[PDB]
Symmetry: C2
Amino acid sequence: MNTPEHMTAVVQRYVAALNAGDLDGIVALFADDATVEEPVGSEPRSGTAAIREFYANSLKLPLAVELTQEVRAVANEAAFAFTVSFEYQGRKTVVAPIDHFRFNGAGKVVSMRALFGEKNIHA
Amino acid sequence: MNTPEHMTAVVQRYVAALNAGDLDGIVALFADDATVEEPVGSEPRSGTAAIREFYANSLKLPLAVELTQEVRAVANEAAFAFTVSFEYQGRKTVVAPIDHFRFNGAGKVVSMRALFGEKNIHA
């Protein structure tokens, strides 16, 4: 089974890559068969190609990202609270999602779902 | 299809009833075929009786539960960060999970999963 230590590291690495703008770094964290659903309720993006393009499009504005609380991790799953902030054509927007990773036996993210609505989008 | 406002009030209500030791108020939030998985990794408790017994056992000690951040709600899901604190036999404990609800069309919780590891239990 996955250690919480590793899962927590991977979450820090995810946030590190977003702050650094490191697309290879982000996609590395995922398994090539993996899925991303951001926000929850949207068409989950599937495969390396789709996940790669999702984060490339996200990283068209430079992002300020930070964990706002300890990572939760157990039984092949982590979840975490954080902010994602960006500024464009006037104003700054702070989104506050809760994300959720499921990890495979190899310790790569096989699914990530980002849960947040309009009410969690502050601008 | 559920509204974010209804899912959000239900999260707040959940916290309030835990604080008020209100077994009935808590169980009334769930549908009859609902599941609770607390912690994540453990065997899901299925149905009103099993869910009721879980909360009956939990409320054997006085709890101080509060939301430490804003609720996330979208589609028919919600997630939240919170703490549960209890003190017993010479020790104060603070457990800091992230919870996730799925809601059915009638506005009741059909599943909860509480995600925390040993690392999120401060005692």
